[PDB]
Amino acid sequence: DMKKHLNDTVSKSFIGRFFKLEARKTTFTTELRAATATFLTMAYIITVNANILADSGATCSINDCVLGSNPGYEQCISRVKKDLVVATSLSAMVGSLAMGLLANLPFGLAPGMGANAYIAYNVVGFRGSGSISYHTAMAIVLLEGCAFLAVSALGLRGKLARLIPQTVRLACAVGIGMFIAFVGLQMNQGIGLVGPDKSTLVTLTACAETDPVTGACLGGKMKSPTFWLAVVGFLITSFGLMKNVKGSMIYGIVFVTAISWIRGTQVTIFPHTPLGDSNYNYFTKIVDFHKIQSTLGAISFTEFRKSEVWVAFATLFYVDLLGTTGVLYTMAEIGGFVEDGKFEGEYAAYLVDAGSSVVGSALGVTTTATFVESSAGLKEGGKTGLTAVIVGLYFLASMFFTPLVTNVPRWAVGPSLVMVGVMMMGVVKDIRWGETKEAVTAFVTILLMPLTYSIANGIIAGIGIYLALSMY
Amino acid sequence: DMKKHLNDTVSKSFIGRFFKLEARKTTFTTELRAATATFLTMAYIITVNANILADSGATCSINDCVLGSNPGYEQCISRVKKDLVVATSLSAMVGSLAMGLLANLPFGLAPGMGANAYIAYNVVGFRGSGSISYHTAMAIVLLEGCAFLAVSALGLRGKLARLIPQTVRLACAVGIGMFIAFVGLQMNQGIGLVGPDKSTLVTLTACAETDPVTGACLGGKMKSPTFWLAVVGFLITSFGLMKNVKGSMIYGIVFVTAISWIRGTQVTIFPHTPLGDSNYNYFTKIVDFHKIQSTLGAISFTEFRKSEVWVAFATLFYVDLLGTTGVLYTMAEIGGFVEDGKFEGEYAAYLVDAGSSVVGSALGVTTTATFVESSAGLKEGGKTGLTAVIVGLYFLASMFFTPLVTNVPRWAVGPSLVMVGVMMMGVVKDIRWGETKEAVTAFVTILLMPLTYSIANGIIAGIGIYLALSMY
Ligand SMILES: C/C(=C\CNc1ncnc2[nH]cnc12)CO
Numbered sequence: 025d026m027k028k029h030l031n032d033t034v035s036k037s038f039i040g041r042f043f044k045l046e047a048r049k050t051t052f053t054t055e056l057r058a059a060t061a062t063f064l065t066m067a068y069i070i071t072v073n074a075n076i077l078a079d080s081g082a083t084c085s086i087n088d089c090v091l092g093s094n095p096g097y098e099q100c101i102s103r104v105k106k107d108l109v110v111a112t113s114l115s116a117m118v119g120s121l122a123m124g125l126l127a128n129l130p131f132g133l134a135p136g137m138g139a140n141a142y143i144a145y146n147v148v149g150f151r152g153s154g155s156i157s158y159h160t161a162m163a164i165v166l167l168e169g170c171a172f173l174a175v176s177a178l179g180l181r182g183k184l185a186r187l188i189p190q191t192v193r194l195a196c197a198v199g200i201g202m203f204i205a206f207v208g209l210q211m212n213q214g215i216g217l218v219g220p221d222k223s224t225l226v227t228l229t230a231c232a233e234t235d236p237v238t239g240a241c242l243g244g245k246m247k248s249p250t251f252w253l254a255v256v257g258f259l260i261t262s263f264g265l266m267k268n269v270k271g272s273m274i275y276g277i278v279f280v281t282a283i284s285w286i287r288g289t290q291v292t293i294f295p296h297t298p299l300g301d302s303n304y305n306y307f308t309k310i311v312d313f314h315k316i317q318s319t320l321g322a323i324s325f326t327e328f329r330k331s332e333v334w335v336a337f338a339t340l341f342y343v344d345l346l347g348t349t350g351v352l353y354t355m356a357e358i359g360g361f362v363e364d365g366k367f368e369g370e371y372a373a374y375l376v377d378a379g380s381s382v383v384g385s386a387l388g389v390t391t392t393a394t395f396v397e398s399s400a401g402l403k404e405g406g407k408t409g410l411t412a413v414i415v416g417l418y419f420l421a422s423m424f425f426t427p428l429v430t431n432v433p434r435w436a437v438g439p440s441l442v443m444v445g446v447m448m449m450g451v452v453k454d455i456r457w458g459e460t461k462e463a464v465t466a467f468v469t470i471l472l473m474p475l476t477y478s479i480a481n482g483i484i485a486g487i488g489i490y491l492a493l494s495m496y
Numbered sequence: 497d498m499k500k501h502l503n504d505t506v507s508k509s510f511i512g513r514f515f516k517l518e519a520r521k522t523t524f525t526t527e528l529r530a531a532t533a534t535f536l537t538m539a540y541i542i543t544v545n546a547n548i549l550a551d552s553g554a555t556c557s558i559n560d561c562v563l564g565s566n567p568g569y570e571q572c573i574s575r576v577k578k579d580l581v582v583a584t585s586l587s588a589m590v591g592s593l594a595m596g597l598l599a600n601l602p603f604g605l606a607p608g609m610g611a612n613a614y615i616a617y618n619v620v621g622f623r624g625s626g627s628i629s630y631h632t633a634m635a636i637v638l639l640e641g642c643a644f645l646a647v648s649a650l651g652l653r654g655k656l657a658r659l660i661p662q663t664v665r666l667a668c669a670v671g672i673g674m675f676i677a678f679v680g681l682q683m684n685q686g687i688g689l690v691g692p693d694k695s696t697l698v699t700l701t702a703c704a705e706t707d708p709v710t711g712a713c714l715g716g717k718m719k720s721p722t723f724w725l726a727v728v729g730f731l732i733t734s735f736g737l738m739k740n741v742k743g744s745m746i747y748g749i750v751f752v753t754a755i756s757w758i759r760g761t762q763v764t765i766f767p768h769t770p771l772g773d774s775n776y777n778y779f780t781k782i783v784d785f786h787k788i789q790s791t792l793g794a795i796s797f798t799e800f801r802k803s804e805v806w807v808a809f810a811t812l813f814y815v816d817l818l819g820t821t822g823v824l825y826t827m828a829e830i831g832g833f834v835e836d837g838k839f840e841g842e843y844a845a846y847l848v849d850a851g852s853s854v855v856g857s858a859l860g861v862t863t864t865a866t867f868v869e870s871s872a873g874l875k876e877g878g879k880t881g882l883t884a885v886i887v888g889l890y891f892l893a894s895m896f897f898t899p900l901v902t903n904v905p906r907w908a909v910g911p912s913l914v915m916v917g918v919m920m921m922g923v924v925k926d927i928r929w930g931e932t933k934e935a936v937t938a939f940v941t942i943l944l945m946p947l948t949y950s951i952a953n954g955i956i957a958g959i960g961i962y963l964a965l966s967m968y
């Protein structure tokens with residue numbers, strides 16, 4: 025019986041009374057279990073979001089040498105990838121802690137997919153491409169976060185995110201899902217299923233004897249030793265949604281990485297090059313305390329005088345308004361929160377999702393949103409902020425394992441990137457495909473995002489068609 | 497009143513009694529109007545299917561000169577494109593006539609989208625690419641048609657097209673729609689919205705100062721004089737489905753072509769090169785009788801001893817079985833045809849759709865299927881084969897205008913190719929997106945077709961995942 029003794033020494037204490045444990049009937053153990061489930065569902069991103077931003081033009085320029093395979097640049101990119109893990113863990117612990125404390129909402133915060141890909145692979149490019157360097161991207165994040173905080177402070181978001189047509193938002197979500205799936209197939213961040221061609225633009229080039237320098241290959245199709253390991257990892261992950269295990273994405277990532285940690289095999293991650301020797305020597309120790317040394321703060325408000333920047337600002341505004349106008353209300357009816365027209369926390373909910381982006385802009389991360397993959401805790405129990413606090417505590421006591429998170433091979437996150445798109449595509453059945461007016465714009469927005477390799481292009485081409493087709 | 501006098505001099509005559517005009521109550525005028533509507537809906541393909549097969553490695557090899565911009569090869573490709581128009585018109589008149597006469601079904605036959613793209617852009621390649629030359633493709637069509645006729649003669653199709661899982665077929669249809677939309681964007685058959693890149697694989701390159709030889713460009717984005725004309729033609733076409741005009745696709749094609757026929761403008765199709773002079777000199781006359789001289793018959797059963805051929809045979813079998821198991825029954829409930837379990841013509845319907853592919857294999861065309869875009873006649877009236885016969889008569893008296901169909905610019909069919917994909921995508925809301933088992937395979941099949949630029953790759957990757965995920 026002493027189990028229930030833990031629910032009277034806590035509920036009647038200050039901690040229980042502060043969160044109103046007696047109201048919205050629940051127990052401390054149930055809230056802890058819900059927090060554990062929603063952490064296991066979400067924990068993947070700490071190693072997924074680290075590998076996307078790392079290969080996105082690190083802070084060191086040619087002065088510390090880009091794409092020429094020089095060990096000097098490789099050491100810097102290793103250090104930067106080491107720092108972004110801690111940065112993402114900190115940005116997930118904060119925000120989640122505020123949402124737990126400022127409001128009584130059992131949610132979680134972390135830099136989600138979709139804004140990280142946008143600023144990572146379109147404006148900063150792949151290791152020095154694009155138009156704007158790394159500092160200007162974080163300046164843009166700062167400006168967008170401040171603007172969204174101002175907009176949510178005194179009410180316009182409800183009156184601004186409701187006038188957008190109901191089809192463009194869903195089409196944009198599907199297009200972002202397709203693009204995040206597409207980016208996980210090239211031999212730059214993905215597994216290597218898609219390669220270049222001369223006659224056509226795309227061609228199946230799972231390719232064994234590949235060219236290390238450029239990216240082409242010299243014969244051998246669908247016989248890559250690492251591509252098949254990635255495929256079996258994807259199958260292991262996919263056999264985790266059926267039969268409904270708690271967390272399967274991290275299970276597949278862990279299995280693939282653990283198989284890859286063997287030294288000497290053809291799918292290894294620690295080769296005999298001295299880069300591999302240094303990586304292994306760092307990997308010997310498991311627990312390591314790391315302090316940010318490179319991307320602690322780097323903001324430059326000196327290039328806000330040209331174009332190709334404010335377009336990114338508008339696109340980030342549109343994507344972040346798409347993200348939050350949706351998931352927040354959706355994961356309110358699952359629990360016993362929704363009333364006739366109120367959340368009892370909606371106003372305080374929108375404030376944190378914008379406030380904990382200013383703290384992340386000068387930290388190494390992108391804008392954050394409440395995770396949709398957190399209903400695994402709501403569907404069990406817990407009605408107050410005893411899950412957000414525990415999630416923040418977990419993320420805080422998950423950054424000490426940096427050596428086990430900075431050596432994940434890039435072919436272990438390809439399945440995760442593909443599965444994110446599969447999960448996102450599920451909303452495509454709510455679009456009214458009957459009328460031509462919605463079908464044309466939805467199809468254009470969906471198709472133009474992965475083919476042209478741009479999200480802003482898709483949004484700007486979907487808005488124009490919908491505007492022109494209704495010129496009355 | 498003499499209008500109704502036309503319904504007694506015909507219904508009581510041999511023509512009326514043969515088609516049982518008194519039964520399945522209808523009138524001759526109603527059937528003629530339905531035939532007119534279903535011809536206007538379908539007529540586009542005569543200029544759409546001609547431009548796809550023309551730029552697919554014409555029969556003349558390097559001996560009559562490939563992609564080097566030599567006038568000798570250009571004359572041959574012009575002659576071949578001239579011949580395929582008549583070939584497609586003949587293949588549409590036949591088959592439709594048989595379906596009108598052999599059975600009492602008010603449908604129409606023509607070489608539909610999806611098998612033409614497959615054999616055109618994957619196995620014969622773009623002007624000499626691929627593994628198999630033109631003759632082997634028609635031999636494959638002959639073999640597939642004979643095999644399907646044998647299978648439909650004594651019953652297996654009902655017992656063979658029903659065991660395929662309900663998700664793979666829909667995913668394949670959506671993937672073919674996406675691929676047919678994708679193929680209409682490159683600067684080879686499409687308008688020019690998508691071009692190559694070095695860092696990424698795809699990049700928006702609507703590009704004004706393009707390179708005539710290779711396909712790249714030398715600066716200027718989204719400022720192509722012909723791309724904007726194609727866009728406005730697409731808008732004209734799309735403002736034809738809302739407000740429900742009879743036929744709008746051919747309207748947009750005609751408008752774009754008529755604007756393009758002006759000589760001297762920047763979007764012209766008759767430049768001052770002597771190729772343009774010869775094309776214009778042929779275009780002076782409007783009505784011209786043409787006889788097939790190059791692709792009348794060319795079948796070679798000499799290379800059926802290697803691989804990379806029977807794979808195409810299996811893929812064609814799968815696609816053609818997907819096509820017919822669906823549309824035929826669907827456009828049976830619209831009219832008063834469906835009974836408890838019978839069509840009164842199902843067995844005779846499946847026979848013609850396979851028989852009129854043998855006649856087309858040694859004619860210049862691909863496998864044909866009953867057009868889904870023929871319900872425009874069913875939804876008005878007509879219950880017997882007084883529309884198929886009229887459709888065949890129209891197609892017969894539509895091949896005399898070859899000069900007005902062989903000079904259509906390639907940027908006038910891009911909107912049509914895009915719109916076909918938009919119309920095909922509408923079935924995506926019947927797939928069960930809830931269970932992971934169907935969602936994963938549907939997403940993989942949908943995504944892998946346009947990205948890898950192959951339909952067989954998508955089918956073979958969607959079948960394997962569904963088989964592996966159910967290994968019990
Ligand atoms: C709106 C933004 C991100 C949204 N991304 C996500 N939003 C909600 N749930 C998720 N799960 C994974 N990624 C996400 C940028 O702050």
Ligand SMILES: C/C(=C\CNc1ncnc2[nH]cnc12)CO
Nearest residue numbers: 608609611819863864865867868
């Ligand atoms: C099965 C095949 C083609 C199917 N294509 C089509 N099938 C049905 N309706 C259409 N409208 C345009 N194209 C089509 C090949 O014979």
